[PDB]
Design a protein around this ligand. Structure first.
Ligand SMILES: *C/C=C(C)/C=C/C=C(C)/C=C/C1=C(C)CCCC1(C)C
Ligand SMILES: CCCCCCCC/C=C/CCCCCCCC(=O)O
Ligand SMILES: CCCCCCCC/C=C\CCCCCCCC(=O)O
Ligand SMILES: CCCCCCCC/C=C\CCCCCCCC(=O)O
Ligand SMILES: CCCCCCCC/C=C\CCCCCCCC(=O)O
Ligand SMILES: CCCCCCCC/C=C\CCCCCCCC(=O)O
Ligand SMILES: [Cl-]
Ligand SMILES: [Cl-]
Length: 264
């Protein structure tokens, strides 16, 4: 049902996709070790924000690893090109994983925004429902990226509606609670908003690749966009969330955070 199954791949195309996914695994698990060791310098009220970055690193890294092995399982070098064998490759498993990773990314933002109590629970609930609506409708849409491009576009429009409403909740909460944030992170969090707008918009662009570049090079382009988007939306984003958590911890008087920032 996916455009990947339609083509043979040159050795160059096949190996580049394999290296993209493998490098993605290495970046996420390298960052996992960073978040783990820095978590001891985060104050208790923010420490779950850094733990969520560890959770996202392993979740994303495992999906990239699974995609890399599925890629090599599905194709073999036959008569001068990589050709589909008995097993299949699909991006649909990324969508299932977003059902978990996107709520984690959203929750760690709400934590460093200093939301608590009922506002935290209600904001998280609406954000997760909007995210799940976006993911599920996009998942259905990409089942038609070979058979029915018109249906891919309409499910994509519905998914984009959820996306825009989710981004509006995020922006409203960020610019409303920016004033509560300590240690100059009221400025940093505005950059986090724009990083999210940029990086998350790469995913719908990848989703439309079957509509504007339905060939083997488009398959490469989509994996390239996923790689840029994953590293930006999870790794760079998590590094900024962790910086904000540590900086607010130090401004709130958490001594391990003050000493960690002092030694750098
Ligand atoms: C770490 C993974 C992330 C941040 C995934 C983000 C995914 C999206 C923002 C998905 C967006 C989509 C649309 C905007 C409509 C087209 C279909 C969806 C899934 C791709
Ligand atoms: C935050 C940014 C993360 C960047 C991740 C991407 C790193 C690798 C980028 C690729 C450089 C282009 C390589 C040329 C592709 C050759 C085309 C082909 O034969 O398949
Ligand atoms: C096995 C595939 C290749 C493995 C790649 C290993 C290289 C990892 C490179 C950077 C990972 C990103 C993690 C960044 C940690 C914090 C960096 C910083 O403090 O500036
Ligand atoms: C390879 C993985 C190394 C992981 C070990 C790091 C231990 C962290 C200790 C700690 O900060 O509590
Ligand atoms: C909540 C989602 C509500 C329904 C979205 C309906 C529009 C997209 C459905 C397309 C059905 C089809 O193309 O056959
Ligand atoms: C070339 C430019 C590539 C830019 C890549 C971004 C790299 C990692 C961002 C790390 C996040 C650090 C938080 C901000 C620190 C601060 O506010 O002073
Ligand atoms: Cl605390
Ligand atoms: Cl993911």
């Amino acid at each position: 049902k996916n455009i990947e199954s339609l083509f043979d791949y040159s050795a160059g195309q096949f190996e580049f996709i394999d290296h993209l996914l493998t490098m993605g695994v290495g970046v996420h698990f390298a960052a996992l070790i960073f978040f783990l060791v820095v978590s001891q310098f985060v104050a208790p009220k923010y420490r779950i924000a850094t733990a969520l970055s560890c959770i996202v690193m392993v979740s994303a890294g495992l999906i990239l690893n699974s995609q890399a092995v599925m890629w090599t399982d599905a194709y073999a070098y036959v008569d001068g090109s990589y050709q589909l064998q008995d097993l299949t490759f699909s991006n649909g498993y990324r969508y299932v994983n977003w059902m978990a990773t996107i709520p984690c990314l959203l929750l760690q933002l709400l934590i460093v925004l200093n939301l608590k109590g009922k506002e935290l629970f209600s904001t998280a609930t609406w954000l997760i429902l909007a995210a799940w609506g976006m993911i599920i409708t996009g998942y259905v849409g990409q089942l038609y990226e070979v058979d029915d491009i018109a249906q891919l576009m309409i499910w994509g429009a519905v998914s984009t509606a959820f996306f825009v409403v989710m981004n509006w909740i995020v922006g409203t909460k960020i610019f409303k609670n920016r004033a509560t944030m300590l240690g100059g992170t009221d400025s940093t969090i505005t950059k986090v908003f724009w990083l999210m707008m940029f990086a998350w918009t790469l995913y719908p662009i990848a989703y439309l690749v079957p509509a504007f570049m339905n060939n083997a090079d488009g398959v490469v382009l989509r994996q390239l966009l996923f790689t840029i988007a994953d590293i930006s939306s999870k790794v760079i984003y998590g590094l900024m969330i962790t910086y904000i958590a540590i900086q607010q911890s130090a401004a709130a008087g958490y001594v391990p955070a003050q000493q960690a920032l002092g030694r750098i």
